[PDB]
Write a protein that binds this ligand. Sequence first.
Ligand SMILES: Fc1cccc(-c2cc[nH]n2)c1
Ligand SMILES: Fc1cccc(-c2cc[nH]n2)c1
Ligand SMILES: Fc1cccc(-c2cc[nH]n2)c1
Ligand SMILES: Fc1cccc(-c2cc[nH]n2)c1
Lengths: 537, 537
Amino acid sequence: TLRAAVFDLDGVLALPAVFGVLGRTEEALALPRGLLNDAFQKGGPEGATTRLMKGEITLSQWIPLMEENCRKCSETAKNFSIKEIFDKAISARKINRPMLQAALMLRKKGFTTAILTNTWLDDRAERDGLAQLMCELKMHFDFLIESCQVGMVKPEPQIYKFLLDTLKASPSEVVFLDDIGANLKPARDLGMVTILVQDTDTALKELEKVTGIQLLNTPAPLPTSCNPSDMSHGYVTVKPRVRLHFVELGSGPAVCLCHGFPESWYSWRYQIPALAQAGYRVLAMDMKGYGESSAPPEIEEYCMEVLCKEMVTFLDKLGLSQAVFIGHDWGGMLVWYMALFYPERVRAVASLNTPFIPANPNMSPLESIKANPVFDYQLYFQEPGVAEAELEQNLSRTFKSLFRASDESVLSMEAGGLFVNSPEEPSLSRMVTEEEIQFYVQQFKKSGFRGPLNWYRNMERNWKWACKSLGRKILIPALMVTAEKDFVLVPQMSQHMEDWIPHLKRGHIEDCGHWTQMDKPTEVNQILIKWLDSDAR
Amino acid sequence: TLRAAVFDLDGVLALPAVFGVLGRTEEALALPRGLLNDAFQKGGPEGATTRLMKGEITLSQWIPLMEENCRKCSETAKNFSIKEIFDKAISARKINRPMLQAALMLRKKGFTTAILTNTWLDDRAERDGLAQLMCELKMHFDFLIESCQVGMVKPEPQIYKFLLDTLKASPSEVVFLDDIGANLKPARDLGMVTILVQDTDTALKELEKVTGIQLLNTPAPLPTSCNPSDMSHGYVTVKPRVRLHFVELGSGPAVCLCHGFPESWYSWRYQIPALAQAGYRVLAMDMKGYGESSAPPEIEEYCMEVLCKEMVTFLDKLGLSQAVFIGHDWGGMLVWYMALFYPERVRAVASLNTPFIPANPNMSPLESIKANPVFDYQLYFQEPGVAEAELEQNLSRTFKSLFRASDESVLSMEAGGLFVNSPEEPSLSRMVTEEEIQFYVQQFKKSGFRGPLNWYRNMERNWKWACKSLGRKILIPALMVTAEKDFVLVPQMSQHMEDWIPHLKRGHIEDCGHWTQMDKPTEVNQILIKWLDSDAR
Ligand SMILES: Fc1cccc(-c2cc[nH]n2)c1
Ligand SMILES: Fc1cccc(-c2cc[nH]n2)c1
Ligand SMILES: Fc1cccc(-c2cc[nH]n2)c1
Ligand SMILES: Fc1cccc(-c2cc[nH]n2)c1
């Protein structure tokens, strides 16, 4: 029974291959057939290409050797640049998405996966393109075995025995996928299941047949998530008693993700890998009062003025002049105030669900709550200790009750608490795994709900501070993303935003409840990436 | 007696001012004298500019109001763009270096320093320039008081009382420097020492006279250093038992700094702020075996092959496709091997002191040590436990004996140890403060010298691995920096590097011992920044 799957890179995980490119170049330049493909493999196991693939020489050293081989082949058969041909061939090669999806599904099902490839040490001025491709791919596999790193090459028998040793599996337990028949032969001779890959669909049909796992025509997979233990964790002291923790991934313009109540940096798990892959340096915060960030007990530590000042200090200490700020819920509220009070530090602003509504100077925030019954829970959150006790009573119940899709409601909104007439053992929502709920449970064991609830206990202070901004407009790039089925932060609440943000851009997500990021991650990523690429680059 | 110094921004800490720019624009456009300067201050305390400076409106909202004021002034006096004029005026404004140097010296001497300024909420598309200027300046002061953040403006009396409250000082204890006489008047009326700033030299002469501290014509100051508690600290698990710690500062291309033996990320303290200010994202490592990084006890955990693999994993986990790698001593050795084995992940490579010398396959690394008496200490480091015992005996003595300039040698290089005939209480070198030695002492209390010494215990393994690279050349951008007075890693050892690195660039530092970064920080920064800007951008 199979338990390991091995994939080649050129022609399997990445397309178009290379035998085809040399073939197309020959046709485009009207050269004798196979002239370039022949110069490429000249000398076989003793030739320049084998030395390149074994890591004896780098790609830049191989270029002049390949040119000499091309000259010899043209001489025998009786503006051209090998550098330009190979630069263009490497650049055009893209990840074979359905092949990657099949490898992802096999790993999800318990398979050990590996990439086994004949590759080179790339020292060209344009090597970063290849570095980026390898980085994106390798993160999805258990092992990456490169010929130039092991000093062995397919079809040599040693690399297969080395592959087996690495997998800690007998040959009958391994499926081996390759586009080159000669490279497939030794794995077959060892007893491995082999697949000659010509077109992806047929290769995947063969793969599905031998594994007994559906891989072709399967549903749209969720975006890549985050394994907390595999992330880079950052810590900045913003003042003597306050440190902020963040997870960091990627390079490019800084993008600061600000979660809501009662969440975590982990609420952005489906966005962090996507945004980093899109070319941004993501900084996903644990907001003040949460997870590994400090949680001072004082109510005044959580007013918007102090939270914004600390986020400015956070940028100062990291040496960042600006970041794009993207917030959800209370984090969305914080991002609009960052745009209003610190525009010079905000490259662009985006909010999920949270609208920008200016303070009414003729109405107390309490009177404004009066007008709307959907915000009654905010009054319940006022008295220190009351909501903490109910929310801390059973963490698994708190999170399982909260984190549900629009059609999974288990909570109602006197004589109460959030959990009146709510199950003691709620069923697990289709949005989350038990493992994910337990991550939030574990995060909230450190400081509980006091800091998070204090974000609601500064209504009067926040209102007074917000009134100082009444004559201003948000004129930096801005995005408002509404969620059709958020029954508290309704899309309708954002209807007048253009009055204060005239150049505002929008996104809208149908069939999406309050927990936007985990409810509809693919759509959130699509919306944010499109907006970042047009407005924040 | 004075104990606080307050500086204005426009015309004091940053030049050229603004009254001069409007004056020059009037002359260049042959407009009536004072026309623009008059439209700028139109309405005085009730006008658009006061509203802008108090934070009632943003800069982008003020532009059309200023245009209407310019129209009214031209109308009364009987291709022009306010946006273009102000964009150019903001951009041309640069930090007044001697003024900043004087503020730095006063703070060093115990003075509380502050910037007090009439400024705006900048929401222009080009706001980042101003954000960068403010960031660079503010880090050097105890307080930054901005009119648009406090909703108060100079010359209003309230801002001065607010300034005093912030400083926690009586007016007679404060020196107040301003370029505007009207803004100086209320500080004088309160009893503060005031300086009208026209030309910097005269202002500094007045400042020197009143403080009794030499500020003008003083020696070249050291580059800005790092306060460990103020840095962003990052942590990446590269394998189950191994995590790497780093300090991170700045934005732009990733620059990974790799220290030597027996050092720390802190050995780069004078480079981190300079490189981040130059436009790079600095990642200063605690190398494996040091400080907050893991220090497994096994010798094999410290061979170059494993250390390089882990640095590749470090990049993978941070989501970086490449970084520039800059190393000193053992870190310099690691960076040449990163260039040789992982060129696709190395944007550029630079070494301080450590030359690139290819492995001699016909000589054992032990036989090669035989040939050179300067490397005898490496044999002493071989036997596990022996050098650890001597180096761990007294940490303060170890570091104070080691970290000295070329003319301060206290150690000799049988029947020994490093500290034979060496003082038990060495004097403090002119290169370091007691505080800095104690930082290294504190770092080495966690894991001691076993991990660091294990870097020397892989000679045979490193030699075997290095021989696989004998047919390669380093063809990515490279810099070799030699130090005239390093008596072990002599500049002469680098003489043949061009044979293997044909495009190699060089730097050379005279009167510089082994501890390059702290010996000659200004010169190191100059060399690295010049090279990064030409070869790594
Ligand atoms: F003022 C705000 C702004 C955004 C979200 C909330 C909120 C209250 C409960 N969940 N989210 C409150
Ligand atoms: F989502 C939002 C946006 C703005 C204000 C509020 C608000 C006012 C009182 N409670 N919450 C909620
Ligand atoms: F192999 C190397 C390379 C660079 C520095 C050293 C070394 C030995 C003592 N200090 N530094 C050894
Ligand atoms: F600085 C260097 C550079 C290269 C090799 C060595 C070496 C060889 C034996 N011990 N150290 C030192």
